[PDB]
Design a protein around this nucleic acid. Sequence first.
DNA 1: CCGAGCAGCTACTTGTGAGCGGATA
DNA 2: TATCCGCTCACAATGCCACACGCGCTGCTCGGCC
RNA 3: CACAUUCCAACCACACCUGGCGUGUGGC
Lengths: 98, 79, 1358, 99
Amino acid sequence: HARSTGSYSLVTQQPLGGKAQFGGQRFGEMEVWALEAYGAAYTLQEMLTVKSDDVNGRTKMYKNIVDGNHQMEPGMPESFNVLLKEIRSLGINIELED
Amino acid sequence: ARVTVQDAVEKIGNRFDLVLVAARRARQMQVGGKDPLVPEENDKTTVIALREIEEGLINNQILDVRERQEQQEQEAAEL
Amino acid sequence: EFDAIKIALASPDMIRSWSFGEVKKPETINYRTFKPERDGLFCARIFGPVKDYECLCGKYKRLKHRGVICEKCGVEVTQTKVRRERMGHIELASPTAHIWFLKSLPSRIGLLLDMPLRDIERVLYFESYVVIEGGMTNLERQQILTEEQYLDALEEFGDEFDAKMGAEAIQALLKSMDLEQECEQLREELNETNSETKRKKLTKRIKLLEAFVQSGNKPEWMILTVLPVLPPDLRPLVPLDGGRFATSDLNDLYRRVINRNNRLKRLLDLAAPDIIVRNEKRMLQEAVDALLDNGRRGRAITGSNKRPLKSLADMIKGKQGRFRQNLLGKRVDYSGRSVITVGPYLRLHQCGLPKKMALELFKPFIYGKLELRGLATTIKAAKKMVEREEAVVWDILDEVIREHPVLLNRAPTLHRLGIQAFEPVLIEGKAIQLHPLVCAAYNADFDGDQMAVHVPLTLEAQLEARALMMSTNNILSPANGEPIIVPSQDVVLGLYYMTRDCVNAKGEGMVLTGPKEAERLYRSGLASLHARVKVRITEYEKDANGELVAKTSLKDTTVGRAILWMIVPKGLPYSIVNQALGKKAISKMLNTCYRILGLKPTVIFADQIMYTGFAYAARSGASVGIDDMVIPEKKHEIISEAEAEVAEIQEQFQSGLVTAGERYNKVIDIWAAANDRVSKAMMDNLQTETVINRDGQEEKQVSFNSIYMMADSGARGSAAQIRQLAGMRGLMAKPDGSIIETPITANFREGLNVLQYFISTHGARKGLADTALKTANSGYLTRRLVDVAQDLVVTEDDCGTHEGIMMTPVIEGGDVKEPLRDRVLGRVTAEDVLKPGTADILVPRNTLLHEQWCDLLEENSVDAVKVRSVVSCDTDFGVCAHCYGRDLARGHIINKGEAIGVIAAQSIGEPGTQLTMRTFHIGGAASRAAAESSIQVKNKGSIKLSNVKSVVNSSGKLVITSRNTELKLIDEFGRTKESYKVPYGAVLAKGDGEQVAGGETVANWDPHTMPVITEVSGFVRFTDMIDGQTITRQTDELTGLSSLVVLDSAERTAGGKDLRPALKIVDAQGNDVLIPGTDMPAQYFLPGKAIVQLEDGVQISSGDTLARIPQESGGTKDITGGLPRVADLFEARRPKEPAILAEISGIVSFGKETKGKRRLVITPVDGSDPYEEMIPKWRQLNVFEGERVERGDVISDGPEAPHDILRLRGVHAVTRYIVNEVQDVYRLQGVKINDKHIEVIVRQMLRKATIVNAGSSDFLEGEQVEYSRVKIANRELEANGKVGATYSRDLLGITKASLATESFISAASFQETTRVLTEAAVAGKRDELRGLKENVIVGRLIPAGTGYAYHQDRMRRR
Amino acid sequence: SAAVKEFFGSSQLSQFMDQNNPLSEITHKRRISALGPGGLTRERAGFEVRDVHPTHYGRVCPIETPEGPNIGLINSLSVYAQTNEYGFLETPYRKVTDG
DNA sequence: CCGAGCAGCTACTTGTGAGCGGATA
DNA sequence: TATCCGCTCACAATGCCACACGCGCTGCTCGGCC
RNA sequence: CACAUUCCAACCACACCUGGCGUGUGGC
Ligand SMILES: [Mg+2]
Ligand SMILES: [Zn+2]
Ligand SMILES: [Zn+2]
């Protein structure tokens, strides 16, 4: 089973998996550990948000690739914003600085 | 083609700066519109960049010099 | 873009500012129409337009009315993505408390309000009043009362005395609380009081108050007055099939909360009775604090299916919160998964990939390449062509994967090799063809394993995968310098068959010109494959410079070696091929090839090795058969002799001479000897019966049996496996762990009995379930270790220090467990290594230890070396490259940036899959006693005594009056080879510096007698020993002379407690002996349980056991050295019986007896006794009242604790002990791990510190401050004339280090989410996201790999 | 009726048979579990329930067990094993006289 | 009417760590 | 009044994949702006 | 006078789906 670009979950804009639904695979935490044990900082940074979570980054990356542009934009992981909003829903205030 | 990069690690200080300068060269060759200084053999930009780095005529200092030179050329043309 | 993240409390005004409306209707949507409600949980004007650029009323739907609101609904027409961030609020009528700040254990309010949590809970659940604004009343202002205590006291005062019973009461208490006044009062109280627990409570309260007043927070904000709500689309709610909708638990939570709030408002509007409104307030509090964290209050309410409900806290904690499921590890696009398959033709650098998989993965690249050529003008045409899969798209797919590598990944990832990079070649099929020489590193067998594939997708990514993650660039394991590309069973079996020469075959004795002619003659069939032939080789040797001198010489070798010589490059000599070429042989061949020729030719060398091995193993025809496994003909007679022996043993037992225990032991040892004999017989049988006539009579050679070829070559079979196969299985185990007295006298080839097979499967199910249970513990340990890790990277090139650790080859137990070389290889020396020759600088400081360096060091016979370490590096927030050493995967020093912690945690957790959980190995499973103190020796050397304190007896031996004495053997070169612990009172038949041979006993000790041996001859008297008060007379029966018994502190009454039995070595005149050198009276104060058989007035000997005090020896104490052992070692947990040490030096004594337990006083000559201690009355005392010992010496015999070790021996002794213990545990199994990993692990483990005296520093004495922070503060103070601080390093368990970190997000990702979140919120903490994991959770570049330089560039900006 | 229906339809023991071959049917109907109500959980089971006892001879097979999360908790009844009237595992044995 | 909120009809883990009495000198 | 000890509560236990399935009923009472 | 836009021969925009969570079973 494989997936280039399919649907995304509604709770958070993350690609699905499995074979029944057209979803990819899960980059497990041990995989992240093995990647950061190597170098590949750009590789992890793209595998985390550009290919999975960036609501406005994956579309831009696809448009660049189909136009012959192998350059990326970091943006921001959507699930990070989901966690921000979830903690904000509680009685705790989190905030990004300058 | 390219199978090993050990000689590149011999020519550059480490592997991180090596891959950084290789990515800069690949960006210059693919979207920057620069010609490869080594005749390719049906290879991607990464392979020819690694080859030109291994030949010893392209590194971080040389890339910075080339960037400064193209900047100077831009300003000379603006005159 | 943005800097560090800040977290603090949420003020009600801040919540109202966040809110874009208030939800009042508890309805979500309608049944007939799917449009949202007016102002329900799902609203339009509060959160946003449910559709893109379309209002709710449909008035403003065009792209030109966007940006304004409507006139009836008032919805700002925009995209629906705005609903992802817009929030509302609920205006709570009765302010409630936050269950997090109330159930933190310790709760924030419970410590801030100096009130027990029980009373706060009583007040919160509306069952007992609490008074406020006491003033002129007789009651205390903070006292609590019940309903009766309120109604009986209301008549005393009703105007000024008030007592509320809600969260509003504690809210008013918070509002009516001063910060500076209470802080000053508590500071004065801490300065005036003198206690331990009270002082700890006071300093915790003052730290809490400081965190309040310093950070921008206010206490009264803890009482939630307004409730923020979760954005609607983020709430799981989707139309299911039919009228039912798939909702979320948070929906029901908010529903019930709004309902209870509305009911409470209605009850307040009608002025309900006090009991009714208080019950409604209690119900609303229950609703809100179940919405916050359900199940924490005690009653886990359910919403549907009678299952525990999901609250907001559940969406963060555990393995299913945002951190563990949606932040750290996320599902990625352009990924695939498929079963693995052996690919034997592809090169080591490449791999196979299915055609359909490659097509589905690289769709955007194919679209781009189609749009490039004049093939597809738009995306629709290219998509249709790809779906049709015409003949014009396959070449495009071949071109886009010309040099575009991918990433292969195993499902369980242990170390860096869990993900590798490979160039894909397209194959027609549905499976992934994998190289055989890398699956071994993957630990992936081909029995149905499924692996994943990922795409780089970026120029930087492709270049990194080709440069770093490529298989060729990873040939040395990051744990040990051993090459991880060691060949597998098939290729090594093929090569062993190719090189195993016979005595007579086709073409034996002829001559060949070169290897090509040999290969021609072999493939022609005119000659055999293995036959002694004289050929001519043309080898090449690397000179001092880059020259390859050629030499042609006639050798006499087998045809197989000559043929294989065409594969090895020119650099290697011929002696590496002129062998049997087993597993170790080919491993060392590949190692030498990589060492001499580098990396570039080694890859193709290994590829050709594998190709030739596969080809020749296929051409050979290796096969195991029934006739291949031979049974020893004399096995039957050995079995009959063994059964006769066990029958005569049973006869002896029935004769009543021998008991059951000795009978069982004899049977076990007889069966073990018989099994060893039959295994040796099977081996020597499998080796013989291979005779071939070469113009002679018999030329018995190495056996050519296929099973022997598979076993001896180390390909797949081992000695024990083939022994269980051909010979008898031997002994088995019972449930408890013992060995059954009836062995398995059968084998696998022969029929196995029913009961024998039953016992075998019973014994094997234990080991089978072992790994299935232990994999979870291993994963948990790996996660804990990596969470402790990844907080340090190589950020400096040099620290500029000289401290390190004294590395020396451990020689405990046997001769030596490991040399010094492998323990210093790949490191840098701190000081000048001193050769045995005086004043030698043969190894200068600050130099990396290469291969030739350690070779010369071993040649010079160096015993120990001070090597740089990580615990000694002074780098702040990281380590320096000049203190770690070699990379262990590159042939050079470590670079700058690579995360040492992550690779260290991975290399530590990898052998977890090879460890054990529990076994009968508890150290003395067979037998252990102090009578073993008869210490022999293997080799010849001179004796050396450490901690010298001993005398000589009149019998000619040497007696030892100490415990810390150590015996060492100095060899003929000067180094140490044997080291042993000299027990107290050992019979040292030798002397210090004496030359003794090997094979003789030098010392011995009594098993069950604590010696009180004297120091000089004299006369003994009953000094301070009165019969009937301190001693008793229990007459002997078999010794003639009776024994005077002494009672312990348990049976002795109070009449003899103040009298301790003593022995005074006096002369004939009356004055006692004087110790030579000092001016102290010589007496031995004997404790209880002393057996004095010696009479009075008799001339005692120098060093004779007078009072035989029986010890408690005879039991096992070795805690099982499995995965729990290393887990408890890293967790720094204290053992059951911790071996207490000596805090201060000097003499010791016993004071107040039975103060709950025994007491003890330590009085030194220099200082006083400011430290008392409690000692149980069931633990033996090594030191007595008269013996003076140095601080840090053992008192209670047993397992030691790392905390006391660190606090009484320094930072180096504790880490040396830790690394020695963990390396012993790992080598017991047979797995090797470099010490640098555990070294950096422990270095990270002791990151925290405490203060003794504040001095001129700003940190208080009762604050656990970070080590590097207080260190840089001390540096700043050293720059001036002020004293820095008095810091003390304290060790904690690995799970605590992931929490006591300046970064709170790194701890929130770990377990214990709620408490760490509350602790960071109450203190207004802000972390500079300086690390790796936090940089992932935020989703940016990591300051470890290639992006580390990027971070440096970001630091130069600010 | 609702209780019986939910017990027969949705429980830790009611499961649709693995209808792929007669062997799986036989080994699934002769399957003895330690989970469910009144039994242990695979998450909280020690090394004692997993191990097989010599008393398991002829009463439950010691070599048939699903390797993985539940080793020893899920077993299969012996061939000649019978259910005692009281609810125990009975094994047949031939009576042996003097000769 | 509609909708929404609420009422009658679990215990073989074990461990580790921290907190709360508690009782004894 | 310090302080060790006993009882009680919070928190922890892979990872993936495949399949299957599922959500207290009926009734009663109170409240909402075309 | 001025701001700001302006609603209709093919077609570009109006697309496409349940890991909420649990349990059970099986495999590596
Ligand atoms: Mg497998
Ligand atoms: Zn509208
Ligand atoms: Zn350093």
